[PDB]
Write a protein that binds this ligand. Structure first.
Ligand code: ADP
Ligand code: ADP
Ligand code: SF4
Ligand code: SF4
Ligand code: MG
Ligand code: MG
Lengths: 276, 276
């Protein structure tokens, strides 16, 4: 068996930093993991690969002819801890649907046997500002059973978490896609942990971990590494290890209860975020 | 004549706060303005209307039968300074293309004579995390000649500005859509103004204004107002007046020069943003 997980959230919230660091911690533990990049920014694997980024399936298929002229062993690349990495890519801005490459990539990986029995986890790193096209495909087509949403005390980040939750509810009549938890990626604001716990409770889930804001992240990423690899003794490395442990142990996977805009604003006022 | 402008940028960067405050300043000056909300969040007019939000064309058309059973005078609403306001709306998450309501809304407004000769400005407030579907329509279909991109020293916000610029370039062979400037909506980071000026120069545009981070924004918005209306004497009100004046006076409208990821990272290192 293997656990198929997706990390969603608004742009810039910390999906790729959190995913790569979480996965490095899982690999450090002895788990076998694949990361599938599902964001057109296409830098979701660079910290595992020590790289600028990774060439995408869409780019590689165009240079080869068709996606069928690609070989899996040419596409997947392994980095830190043996973690396997692939990027979907997507059309250029203004050209066609931004999510179209996700559909091509996931179907290619399934057809070509990338989901080998020895994997313990797959993580999709998915753009979450809109829930449509290929970005909704991991939910609509039952590819990721465990959705973890990275968010913060920012109103926009909580709105995104609510919208992703609505997408999960919409497709709950078939498949088994569920909300697994919220990950608070801190902005250093007062009562932010309490706020995201409260939001998680309203949605029916949990806040699986509070990730502190720590400049060691920037220092590791300048050097194209996870914190786990850059400084295994760092306080922040232990934070990612705690998140990984709780993901491994998590058994709460729910059909969430999306909330109203009024409820979101009440949360913000209650925990004095707008009044800090 | 009337100047058709669109405000683009990544989610949560400050599009709606900046647009409504800029437009309130224009109205305070004696200009006649319409705001067209092109973001599914659909709260792009609430500070002009003193409201929770505004019911959307998609919602109103569903309750009426077809969009053709709607009347313009039933749809457009006027608030502070006589500013006219409309929201496009969009399908729910997981259901169809998130941008589809923008196409319906803009076509309805054109057909029904909303672009009356007495308007001085129209501002579209457009989601910019993806440049496709209805979100690309103002560029692809020549609806907004002047694009202003709200951004910050955040890497993701600058990447979004670059992606929007690529969309402008893609459609430059017809129509007259141009990049008018970058608006820096500050994160209180050192050298942020210098960074966005440098990015603007690389793209071929200008940084039209540096908007400071100021808590008066939160206090005004809790009360459903622009800063212009909430406290006309506030320092931040004068900041929005300066931005409005420079928009009125701006004559630089370019086909931009998108940059590489390497150039973006160099900008970040040069101005010590990641090392603050
Ligand atoms: N916990 C953290 N502490 C400090 N910086 C962070 C943290 N998480 C993310 N960042 C920084 O935030 C920026 C955006 O994160 P990223 O994971 O790329 O966002 P996304 O993938 O959601 O667009 C990156 O520069 C990253 O280094
Ligand atoms: N200059 C500013 N100073 C302080 N807070 C701001 C400023 N600009 C925006 N904000 C706050 O940032 C949040 C997001 O802004 P908004 O305009 O809604 O973003 P967008 O429309 O781009 O998603 C809002 O809570 C807003 O009040
Ligand atoms: S939102 Fe992108 S194409 Fe539908
Ligand atoms: S990205 Fe939304 S539907 Fe194409
Ligand atoms: Mg990312
Ligand atoms: Mg907005």
């Amino acid at each position: 068996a293997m656990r198929q997980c997706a990390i969603y959230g608004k742009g810039g919230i910390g999906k790729s930093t959190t995913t790569q660091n979480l996965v490095a911690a899982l690999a450090e533990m002895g788990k076998k993991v694949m990361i599938v990049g599902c964001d057109p920014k296409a830098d979701s694997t660079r910290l595992i690969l020590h790289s600028k980024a990774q060439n995408t399936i869409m780019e590689m298929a165009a240079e080869a002819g068709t996606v069928e002229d690609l070989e899996l062993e040419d596409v997947l690349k392994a980095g830190y801890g043996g973690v396997k990495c692939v990027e979907s890519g997507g059309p250029e801005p203004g050209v066609g649907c931004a999510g179209r490459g996700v559909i091509t990539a996931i179907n290619f990986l399934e057809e070509e046997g990338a989901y080998e029995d020895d994997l313990d986890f797959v993580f999709y790193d998915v753009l979450g500002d809109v829930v449509c096209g290929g970005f909704a495909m991991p939910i609509r087509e039952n590819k990721a059973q465990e959705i973890y949403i990275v968010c913060s005390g920012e109103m926009m980040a909580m709105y995104a978490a609510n919208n992703i939750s609505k997408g999960i509810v919409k497709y709950a009549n078939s498949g088994s896609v569920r909300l697994g938890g919220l990950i608070c990626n801190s902005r250093n604001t007062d009562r932010e942990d309490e706020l995201i716990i409260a939001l998680a409770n309203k949605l029916g889930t949990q806040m699986i971990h509070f990730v502190p804001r720590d400049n060691v992240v920037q220092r590791a990423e300048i050097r194209r590494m996870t914190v786990i690899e850059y400084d295994p003794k760092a306080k922040q490395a232990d934070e990612y290890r705690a998140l990984a442990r709780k993901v491994v142990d998590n058994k709460l996977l729910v059909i969430p209860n999306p909330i109203t805009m009024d409820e979101l604003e009440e949360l913000l006022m209650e925990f004095g975020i707008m009044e800090v």
